[PDB]
Each structure stands twice: as C-alpha cells, then as structure tokens.
Amino acid sequence: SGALDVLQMKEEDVLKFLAAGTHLGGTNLDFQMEQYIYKRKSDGIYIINLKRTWEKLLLAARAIVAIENPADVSVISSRNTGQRAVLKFAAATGATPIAGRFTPGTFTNQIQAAFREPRLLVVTDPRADHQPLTEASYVNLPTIALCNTDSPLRYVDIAIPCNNKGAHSVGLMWWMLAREVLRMRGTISREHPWEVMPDLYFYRDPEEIEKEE
Amino acid sequence: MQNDAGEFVDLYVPRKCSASNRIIGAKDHASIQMNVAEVDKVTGRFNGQFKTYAICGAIRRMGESDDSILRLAKADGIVSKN
Amino acid sequence: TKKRRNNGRAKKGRGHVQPIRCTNCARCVPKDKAIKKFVIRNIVEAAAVRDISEASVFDAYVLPKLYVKLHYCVSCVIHSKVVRNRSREARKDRTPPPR
Amino acid sequence: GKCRGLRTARKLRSHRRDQKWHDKQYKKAHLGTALKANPFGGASHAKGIVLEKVGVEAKQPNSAIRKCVRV
Amino acid sequence: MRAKWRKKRMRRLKRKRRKMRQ
Amino acid sequence: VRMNVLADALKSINNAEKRGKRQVLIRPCSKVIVRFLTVMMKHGYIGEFEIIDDHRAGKIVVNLTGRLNKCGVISPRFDVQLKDLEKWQNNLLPSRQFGFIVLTTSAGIMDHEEARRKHTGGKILGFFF
Amino acid sequence: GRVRTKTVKKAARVIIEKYYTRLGNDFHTNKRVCEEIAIIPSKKLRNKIAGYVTHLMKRIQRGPVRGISIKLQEEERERRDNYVPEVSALDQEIIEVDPDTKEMLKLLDFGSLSNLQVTQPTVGMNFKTPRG
Amino acid sequence: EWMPVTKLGRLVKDMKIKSLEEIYLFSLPIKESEIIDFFLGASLKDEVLKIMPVQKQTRAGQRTRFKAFVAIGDYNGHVGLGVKCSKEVATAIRGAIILAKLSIVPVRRGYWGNKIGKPHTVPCKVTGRCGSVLVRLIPAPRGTGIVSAPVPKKLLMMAGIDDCYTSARGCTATLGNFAKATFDAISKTYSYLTPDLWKETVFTKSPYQEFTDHLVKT
Amino acid sequence: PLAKDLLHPSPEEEKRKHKKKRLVQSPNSYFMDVKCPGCYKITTVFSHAQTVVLCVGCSTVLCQPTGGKARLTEGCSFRRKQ
RNA sequence: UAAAGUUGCUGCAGUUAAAAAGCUCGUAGUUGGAUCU
RNA sequence: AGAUACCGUCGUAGUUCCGACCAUAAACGAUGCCGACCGGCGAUGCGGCGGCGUUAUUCCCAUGACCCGCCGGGCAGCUUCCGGGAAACCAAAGUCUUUGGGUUCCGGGGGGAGUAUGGUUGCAAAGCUGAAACUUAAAGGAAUUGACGGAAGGGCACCACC
C-alpha cells in the first residue's frame, strides 16, 4: 500500500476476504511462508494475515502494471479451480491466458507452435503450476504466485499469501488482482465499487451450473 | 574497470543482485530484473516511474527471491512499514 | 556398489541381532533381515465351510482361525514369490501393497 | 588429516621418510637388491662372450622368431 | 580359486613345511 | 575441543557470506578476532559489527556486505619475514590488484601492505579477498 | 478393429479447425465439402475423414475438442463463463469467524465490524490422522 | 534471409540492440546464432577441436555417431565452445559451430601488475571444473604468453588472453572435459567480484522494456 | 534472521531457545518466596530445588525434588522474585 | 632432474578404484578457550 | 556319466557350564576421534518445560494413559540446484587450486604375496611384524547400450493351445 490512505485496505475488501475464507490456510506451514501467517488455530488451521495479503497483492499489481504491453504478462492455471478466474483476468487486463494443461517447452522451445515469451508470469498455485514455474527459470521470467501456507516459494518472486484451494478464494483473489491492476493503470476508479463482482470469476461445478439456471 | 591512464577497459559492467551484491553472470538465465511501478501519492495511479530490482538465479532457486524483493520494496517505501 | 541404504535389513543402532530359522529351508537369517509374513487363515477352507457349518452341533459356531507367522530367507521368499525384484526407483518404496 | 604444528617437523620428515619406501622406484633404487640382481651391475653396457645362438618366440598376439644370443 | 580356499592351501603348505623341516 | 577461535570465526563468516546472509554470529569473541575484523572492515569487506558482552566471552554480530569471496586462517601462525611476504602473497592472494594477507606484528595486527610500509614482519594470521 | 488412424483424425482436425462453418450436418454433405477443398486421392480416405468429421462435430455439440483451436469455440467458452447472479455469493449478512481470526482483524483495525458472528472454538485438538 | 523467431532476434535485426554487451548485461538466452553472426560474424574464427566417434551397441553391431567439439571466438574478448553429436561428421561440425556461436561468453581481462595499456591477462586466479578436470588460470606478466596445454591454449588465445599461467588436474586426456573446464574458467572471469566492481549498479531498461512498442506492432 | 534487532520483536523467539544458546544466556529457573498457611514467615526456595526443604519454624515438607522443577505442597502460596 | 599434485610442507589420497587399527584406555609426542592500556 | 557334494538315515569331536589359553571375522556404516559452521519436514526414544480438552485413581491437588507444542542429547527417515563426487551417491562423503581448526592410523599399477626369512607370542592351531628375485600393460571403480539368464512379470499368431 505504501502507507497511502488511497491504497489502504477497505472494509468491503476485508468482508469479501472473510466470506470467501481467504484467511484460512492449511494444517501445514512452509517455512518461507511464516512471515505471512498470524497464528495457528486450535484445529491446526493457520490464519493468513490479511494485511500482508493486501500488501503482497498491491505489490503484484504494481509489478503487473509496470509492463506497458499487457499481452506480455502470462496468467496460468493448470487446476480447474482457477481457469475461469484466469480467463476473466486476461479479458479484463489484456493479459495472455494459459488455462488448462501447460505443455512443457512453451517458454523454452522456440520451434514449438505455442511458443511465447512473456515478460511476467502469474500462477494460481506453485504446486500445481510447477511446470511454468520451472520454465520461468530458463528465460529470466519473474513470477507472481497465489501461495497457500504450505506452498513452496522456489522460483516465486512475489508470493500472495492466500487460500488457493477453495474456488471462492481463488476467484476472489484473481478478481482483486484484476481490480487493482485496472485501478493502478488508470482504467476505472477507486471512488466507486467496480461493476464486475467476484462471483463471475468463480469456478462452479457443472451440477451447480445446471441447478442455478 | 580502469587502468593507469584513467579510461575504463572492461567490455561491460555486469549487474549485481539487489539482495546479495553478487555479480549476475552472462548466462544466468534464472536471474530476473523486475520493475515495480511507482504510484502517485494522492490518486493512487501509475505515474510512469518504477523501481528496479535484479535478483540472481541462486536466490530464486533457494526460494528467497520473494523475501528479498519484499525487503527491498519495504526499504524502498513501496510496501508499507508494518 | 551399495544396492540399499539399509543393506536389506533393519539393523540400525545395534551390533548383533539374534537369528531365526527360515520356515521353508531352516536357514539362519537375522530377525531384522528375515522377511516376515503373518497369515490369518480360516481353519476350514472356503469349500468346506458349508459342510462343517451344516454338520455343526451348535448354532452359529463361528469357526476358529489359524495365526501363523512365517519367517523367510531372501532366497526362499524370492522363490515363493512373497517378494520380488523391483526397479531401482521402485525399490525405495516401503509402502505395503493394498489389502 | 595430517598434522599442522610448528613443532611437527620431526613427525612430518619421519613419516615422509618411512612412506617413501612404499614407492616402488625409490625402493628399487635405494634397497640395493636390484643392483645386486642386475647382471650389468649398474653399468650401461657390458662385454660378453657368445655361448650359443638362441631363437626366442614372439609373444602370443604376434608370431616370429626373435634371433637372440646367450652371452 | 576362492580366496579363502587359497588361504587354506597356503596354511596346509606351511604346516607341511613345518613338519618336513625338523 | 576448539583451538584457534579465529579459525572458527573466519569459517563462520565465510559460510554465512556464501549463503548470502546479511549478518553472522561469531562466538567466542577475542581481541585477535576483533582486530582481524577491523582490518577486514577498513577495506570495505564486511561492514559494521556489534560486540555482545556476556560476562564469560563475548559474541560478535557481523553485518555482511556481499563483497567477500574468501576469508581464511593460516594455521600454524608461520613467522613471516619481509622477504617471504611476496611468496606468501603469490600463494594466497588471487591477484596482485586486490586481496590482503593479515599479519600480527609487534606494531599491531595489519595487512601485508601496511606491514611493508612500516618495514616489519610477523606471524601470518590469515587472508581475505 | 475400427480405430481411426492419425491421418484420418488429424486431417479431420485440420478441416474442422479451418472450415468449421463450411461443414454440414449430414455425413453425405460432409464428404462433398471435404472433397471440394482437400486433395484426398481416393474415395475411401475422403469417406473416412468425412466420417470422423461427423463424429467430431457430434462431440462439438457438448464441448470442446482438444486438438481444435477454432475461434468460435473460444467465443462459446467465454459466453458460457459470462454468468453472474443478482446477489454475490460473498454478499452475506452473517459471517462465522473464529476468535483467533477476530483477534487478527482487531489488530488489523477491523474489530469494529458488526457483520461477523462468534463461532465457538473446537472442543479439542484432534486433527491429525492416526499414524501407521 | 534471416527471419527472427525470438523477441531478441527481432530487436537485434532492426538495429535496436547496439551491442552484444546489452544482451550479456541482462543475461538473456541467445536462441538464434544469427544474432552472434550479426554482432561478431566478421571476426569470429571457429576451430574444430576434435571429432570423436561414439558407439552404441544394438541387436546387430554398433551404431556410430561423431561428436564435434568446436571452439569459436574473436580474439578480442569473446569465446564459445560447442559440442554436437550426429550421424555424419559434416552435420556434426555444422551443429557444433552453431552451438559454439550460441554459447559465446564475454571475457574479462585484467593486468598482472602495473596497469599501462590494454588488459592482457585474466583479472585474477580462476578455476573451472568439468568431470574431474580442473583448470586454473593465473595472471601472468605481459609478454609471457599462454603457458598451458594445447587444448586450453586454443581457447585462451581465442578469448584474447595474451599471457596466462595454467594449472590442470585430472584426466585431461579426455579432450572434451579439458575444453569444457577451461571454458568454465574463462567464463568465470566476469562472475568474479573484484573491488573495482563494488560500485553500486545503475539499472537500465531492458531491451524488452525499452523497445516494447516495436515488438507490439510486429 | 537479522539478529539482536528491535524492529522485529523477539521476546518469544528468545525465551523459546535453549538457555545456553540464547544471545546472552540466562537461567530458566527462579527463586520464590513461599508462605505456608500454618507458618508465619517467608521461605525463599529455588524452583529446581534438590533438597526436601522444611519450614523454618515447623517440620512441614515445603517441596520435593523432581527431575526438573521441584514440586510444592498444596496450600503453600509461592511467588517468584524479580 | 622436471614432467610427479604418481611421496603431496606448499600439495595427494583412504564408502565402492590401493587404503580407517575389532574396540576402548593410556605415557611420551603434537595441539590447546576468554581475559591484564 | 562320475558325486568324492547338494538330498535322506545315523553319527564322533563339538554345540552347554566352570577354570585356563587363542586374539581372529564382510569384527562393516567396507566411512578414525575431537571442535565450529552450513537447508527444510514429519516421526520416534529418554529427560525437562508449557498448555484447551478426554479418561483412571471411583473423593481436592498430584500422579499415570491420551492430545497439542517447545528445549536438549539419541537411533533413524523423507526431501532439497547447500555444496561435493568418476559416478553410484552423501546434509556429510559439504564448508577443497578461493587448497592450512587439532590429532592418530594408514595407501602409492596388477601379480609374486601377507609368500619367504628373521624376530616375537602360543601347548597347538596359529597371531603380530614382514621382503626380494621375477613377471606383467593393464588389473580395477562407477555408470551406459546391447546380448544372455535353468530371474520375475506381461502381450501376440489355429505355422500356439483350448
């Protein structure tokens, strides 16, 4: 936030985070994720410090904004939980999405069909998205990740401490990232809530898709 | 860098990791140079300025690039104190 | 070259382990290096369950079981196919097969 | 490891002197058995009397008669 | 030849020499 | 048991600097360690350090600035004359452009250039570059 | 064995990737359009590619096909993903929050929020699965 | 004609990257040998260090491939080493030349003593290692020449080192490991942090950031 | 991780360490003033006492030695000093 | 003699290539924590 | 085929104990001891410290059995581009040409050969110490691809079977 009242945390943001359960980590704690937790609960669940989450989200948004060609940022999601969120983020901010399987050699094999050379990489989970993470170490590609308590931080340059297992949490995290990137760029404004709401970024089961119509 | 006559004789001056102050080699393809955008004090928008941080491949490999970039941003006013 | 980190036995932190005789050949093998199976068997085979149950003098006798611990040397355990050779990477897996 | 003390010169020198005897060439040169066993007795050349002409078979991979002389 | 059997052979040779060399 | 506390301190500084750490803890502290550290710091190789005073034998927290390639000890402390200094420099230092050999001389603990300036010899403590 | 080889499958994949709108609904239309815009040497091969075109298009009505990168499929996916209710799932009146996360909020200058509700902590610390 | 496949290649072809040192400064991978052909293609000299036949036994006889070790480099601070294995010797040599061009690294040169004139030797003692072969390079006085074995001498001369002392340990008979170890020792010259490289580094816009819109319109 | 630093508090990371391994070593024990309800005077007892101490005016077992911290009898009110 | 860092003080090795005593104790030898302007 | 062996039936010394001897093992972690430093994680054994809650002492506290942690030694394990190594692999077999913390034993191509001889110890068997002449261009280590296996697991053809 930079100790800026314009960039500080709002009550609506905290309420959304609590409703989505973003503060809820796992029973395991990666030693490089210690500074981002608050305390362990009596049932073993680690609580993620939401102020630190906001700080890291704003730092990631600043890193994304400082790339003039938006298509030079790649947003990855191998898991089905974050594919919809990544597609919506790419549509909103102009980034390039890789939803689904990330074929190896996409960053390293210049002969390949889907070969692309991003300037920044954002992944939904270091564990699930370990392949783009490892490939980023071959082409000088910095990485932004949504990291749970037990996520490994290797090849992750900006880790956003959050629950990345729940569909609500992942969707909301991507939604906040898109909102903050747009706000920092110049599009939209902080004087009014954003028109999009996080439920559009969420992943929904096909049974729920059928039921809700 | 220099000789007795005073001119600079190196081919180039390689960068140093902003966290470890070690030379980043010519073939350190895991090293990154990340620019973090500066934000205008009153409106919170990108003002065209940024602060650069070069992190070597070793630091990224040991998982310490995240904490090092956090430390640099905190010492640079980007990340709020406390 | 060393094939296994534990040398194919569980002897860590002691010098000597008492031997036992293989049930198949009467070979002396250390108790930690011996390959141990604990069989629980119905004393009446599946085909003979009906006949004995019908011929019982009681109602719902629930037939007794048989608890036999077998200790095998490596050669007899390999020939009997209790254990088998594995790939260099699958060797390290100590997880028992599903049952 | 090896000793590194300012007063270990006797230890180092003595250990080197004992360990030099496990050098095959050093032992051959300094034991005196090889010089005794050498028919030339330390000479580069020697004069002799030819006793007979002997034909020596070349070793197995090759095949020839090496024409030698007993002297 | 197995090393221990060669060792046994050498032991037997030494014993025979000790017997013969009175 | 531990001899040569300076060897332990130098190995600790070396191991910490190779891991890219910002500070290193050294225990026990000693006058020779403090003088060697001061020589290292006057040439810009370590940075500031704090002497924690416990009533038995102090500790030192040394701030590391990653300009150090190798700090090492030379055991035993061979007596070094001004003639042998060039041979020791050739053996130990990576270049004639940089790197220092630290000696303890009757004029104090100093690098090899300062020992040549005062025209003195002494005993080699170690080296850093 | 009626497995269709990579020639048939890949040619049909390229055709549906390329001339997705040009296709028909009946197999006999499919073979005619395939023979119009493809150098297929023989009748049997063009029949086989046409048949797999029909089967692939049948697979299209229910979802995407892995090897196909048509723009219309992306448009369909992005329209299907453009669903939003009138009420956000995160818009709820009562949020159950444990005391520890309440203390986290309070140290975060958010202890004055009245949207949360006290959920009592667990009776015990029995969360590990039994060992062995 | 050269049709660049990478962003770096496109930036180089359009005269946006003024030197090869701008690529080395940001440590960008060079995936196109035409970049090196552009920047140094008039002064590079390639030498086939060796052709080595390697045999893989099969159901009937040994399948033989030939591995070309090729050293390349202009004699003014750039050198590369490339190894390529192929069925035919000619294509192995072609691929090895390509790979040596791709692996060209800068060479830092220094002074043994007084700093009059251009640098002539290695800035300091540097050791390189490859598969039990250790090659140590030591600064030497001006006019000494390369005091080394022929294999490291070739690479050191190609790198613009005029005088240097050499030590070698291990199975240097294996020419590939010897060459790779001396190449590693040469490439470690610019990775060594000497006190003249203590000045704080002034960060510059990377080529991808500086000429972004050029690539966007493409 | 940035030892002896006030910016990141570590009372909790220092009293967690081994007593000898702390920055400055300090005992984990204490002396305690004990009142016995039947008695009328202070008794200063070591926390890790190895002696079965009795009241200075009576014959009541104040505490018993254990493997570590001594076990006090019921009703005796004990308060640490300093 | 150098090459031989294949006698290694500089400067070698000792899991599997040659090699750490079966294991402890122990005199000589060697080596020894902080601290005094 | 032969068996002098494997397999079977017997069976002496021995295997057991007491008192003297012997001092050797793939006596192995094929890895000397002491000290410092350099990742992560979950367990486990002992001791201590702290703490919701559950049980037994059929009553207060305490004390046991659990549960959640912390600290110290210990046997280990998993993981890791710490680093090393010829590699196998090793958080030591790391902190090594950027080579020096202290110290003991010990190796120097393969055989001859742990042999001869001398000394010494032992009742003996043998143990410790321990060559040379001579012979030889390799012997050896790790890993790779094949071939083969009286190794295991699969698949296929009515030139296989049912």
d(CA H148, CA H155): 11
Amino acid at A130: H
> What's the CATH number for F1-68?
3.30.1370.30
d(CA F124, CA D9): 19
I4: nearest CA in chain F? F61
Structural domain count of chain I: 1
> Do the beta carbons of residue D69 and residue D54 sit within 8 Å?
yes
Token pair 């452009």 is found at: F97
Helix (H) or strand (E) run with residue F125 in it: strand F122-128
CATH for B24: 3.30.1230.20
3-state helix, strand and coil shares in percent for chain H, rounded to the nearest 5: 35, 25, 40
- DSSP, collapsed to helix, strand or coil, labels residue C77 as helix
Domain that holds residue B50: 1-82
- DSSP, collapsed to helix, strand or coil, labels residue H127 as strand
Q: Do F23 and I23 touch (CB under 8 A)?
A: no
Residues 6+ apart with CB under 8 A from A89: A75, A95, A97, A174, A175, A177, A178, A201
Closest CA to F101 of F74, F68, F65: F74
D5 CB neighbours in chain F (<8 A) are 76
d(CA B56, CA B19): 9
Enter the DSSP assignment of A123: E
Closest CA to B15 of B25, B7, B28: B25
CA distance, residue H190 to nearest chain B CA (Å): 7
F61 CB neighbours in chain I (<8 A) are 3-4
Enter the DSSP assignment of A56: H
Helix (H) or strand (E) run with residue H165 in it: strand H164-169
d(CA A210, CA G88): 18
**Residues, chain G:** 132
Task: Give the angle subtended at the CA of H117 by the CAs of H116 and H118, to the nearest 5°.
Answer: 135
Question: Annotated binding site of I for Zn(2+), which residues?
Answer: 36, 39, 55, 58
Q: Is H191 exposed, middle or buried (0-12, 13-18, 19+ CB in 10 A)?
A: middle
What sections of chain A are H helices per DSSP?
11-20, 50-65, 83-93, 130-136, 167-185, 206-211
d(CA A46, CA A147): 13
Residues 6+ apart with CB under 8 A from A63: A120, A142, A144, A158, B34, B35, B36, B37
Q: Is B56 exposed, middle or buried (0-12, 13-18, 19+ CB in 10 A)?
A: buried
Residues 6+ apart with CB under 8 A from G127: A27, A43, A44
d(CA H69, CA H49): 5
DSSP symbols for C9-48: S---S-S---EEE-TTT--EEETTTSEEEEEEEESS-TTT
d(CA A141, CA B55): 11
> Do the beta carbons of residue F128 and residue F40 sit within 8 Å?
yes
Task: Give the angle subtended at the CA of H95 by the CAs of H92 and H96, to the nearest 5°.
Answer: 80
Give the number of other Cβ atoms within 10 Å of residue B27's Cβ: 16
Residue A2 belongs to a domain: no
What values do phi and psi take at G106, rounded to 5?
A: -65, -40
Round to the nearest angstrom and report the end-to-end CA distance of chain G: 48
> Do the beta carbons of residue C24 and residue C82 sit within 8 Å?
no
Closest nucleotide to I74: CA versus each C1': K61
- Listed as ranges, the nucleotides of chain J within 7 A of a protein C-beta are 5-16, 20, 29-36
What sections of G1-121 are H helices per DSSP?
6-18, 27-36, 43-60, 71-80, 99-107
Tell me the fold of G1-61. Diphtheria Toxin Repressor; domain 2 (1.10.60)
Domain that holds residue H190: 107-200
DSSP symbols for B32-72: EEEEEEEE-TTT--EEEEEEEEEE-HHHHHTT-HHHHHHHH
> Do the beta carbons of residue H35 and residue H24 sit within 8 Å?
no
Both tokens of A195, joined, read: 């028109």
Mutation target vs G (from A11, A18, A29, A80; most G CBs, 10 A cutoff): A18
Where are the domains positioned within chain F?
1-68, 69-129
Amino acid at A23: H
- B59 near F CB under 8 A: yes
Both tokens of I41, joined, read: 């005077």
d(CA A46, CA A38): 7
> Do the beta carbons of residue A53 and residue A162 sit within 8 Å?
yes
Q: Is the peptide bond before I11 cis (omega within 30 degrees of 0)?
A: no
DSSP bridge partners of H165: H138, H147
B25 vs H27, H119, H201: nearest CB = H27
SS3 labels along chain I: CCCCCCCCCCHHHHCCCCCCCCCCCCCCCCEEEEECCCCCCCEEEECCCCCCCECCCCCCECEECCCCCCEECCCCEEEECC
- DSSP, collapsed to helix, strand or coil, labels residue D65 as strand
**Residue lying closest to nucleotide K102, CA to C1':** F3
d(CA H216, CA A70): 10
Token pair 């939003």 is found at: G84
Closest nucleotide to H134: CA versus each C1': K97
d(CA C25, CA C74): 11
> Do the beta carbons of residue A200 and residue A165 sit within 8 Å?
no
Residue H147 belongs to a domain: yes
> Do the beta carbons of residue F85 and residue F101 sit within 8 Å?
yes
Q: Do D4 and F75 touch (CB under 8 A)?
A: yes
Domain shared by H82 and H4, yes or no: yes
d(CA A66, CA B36): 6
> Do the beta carbons of residue F66 and residue H198 sit within 8 Å?
no
Both tokens of B2, joined, read: 């220099």
Domain that holds residue I3: 1-82
Domain shared by H90 and H27, yes or no: yes
Enter the DSSP assignment of C59: S
Domain C1-99 belongs in CATH node 3.50.50.60: no
Final residue of a structural domain among H58, H87, H106: H106
Q: Do A110 and H29 touch (CB under 8 A)?
A: no
**Residues, chain D:** 71
Both tokens of A53, joined, read: 């989450």
Structural domain count of chain H: 2
> What's the CATH number for F69-129?
3.30.1490.10
Amino acid at A65: V
Q: Is the peptide bond before F76 cis (omega within 30 degrees of 0)?
A: yes
- Listed as ranges, the nucleotides of chain K within 7 A of a protein C-beta are 29-44, 47-54, 60-63, 67-79, 81-83, 85-90, 93-109, 113-117, 125-126, 131-134, 136-137, 141-143, 145-147, 151-153
H29: nearest CA in chain B? B29
Q: Do G88 and A14 touch (CB under 8 A)?
A: no
Q: Do F95 and H125 touch (CB under 8 A)?
A: yes
Closest nucleotide to D8: CA versus each C1': J30
CA distance, residue H33 to nearest chain A CA (Å): 13
Q: How far is the CA of F75 from the C1' of J31 (A)?
A: 11
CATH for H77: 3.30.160.20
- Exposure of H69 in the CB half-sphere (CA atoms within 13 A): 18
A139 CB neighbours in chain H (<8 A) are 29
Closest nucleotide to D23: CA versus each C1': K108
H146-153 contacts, C-beta under 8 A, 24 or more apart:
H149/H178, H151/H49, H151/H175, H151/H178, H151/H179, H151/H182, H152/H178, H152/H179, H152/H182
Mutation target vs B (from F18, F19, F95; most B CBs, 10 A cutoff): F19
A16 vs G78, G83, G90: nearest CB = G90
Closest CA to B29 of H9, H32, H203, A108: A108
Both tokens of B27, joined, read: 């073939």
Amino acid at A52: R
Kindly list the partner chains of chain D, i.e. chains with 3 or more CB atom pairs below 8 Å.
Answer: F
Amino acid at G32: R
d(CA A176, CA G95): 20
Structural domain count of chain A: 1
Question: Annotated binding site of I, which residues?
Answer: 36, 39, 55, 58
DSSP bridge partners of D66: D56
The distance from CA C83 to its chain's CA centroid, rounded to whole angstroms, is: 9
Both tokens of G26, joined, read: 């009946």
Q: How far is the CA of A127 from the C1' of K78 (A)?
A: 18
Q: Please tell me the experimental approach by which this structure was elucidated.
A: cryo-EM
DSSP symbols for H48-96: EEEEEEEEEE-SSSEEEEEEEEEEE--TTTEEEEEEEEESSHHHHHHHH
Give the number of other Cβ atoms within 10 Å of residue H69's Cβ: 25
CATH for I29: 2.20.25.100
CA distance, residue I15 to nearest chain F CA (Å): 17
Both tokens of G91, joined, read: 């818009």
> Do the beta carbons of residue H198 and residue B30 sit within 8 Å?
no
DSSP symbols for F14-55: HHHHHTT-SEEEESS--HHHHHHHHHHHHTTSS--EEEE--S
> Do the beta carbons of residue G2 and residue G51 sit within 8 Å?
no
Q: How far is the CA of H35 from the C1' of K66 (A)?
A: 70
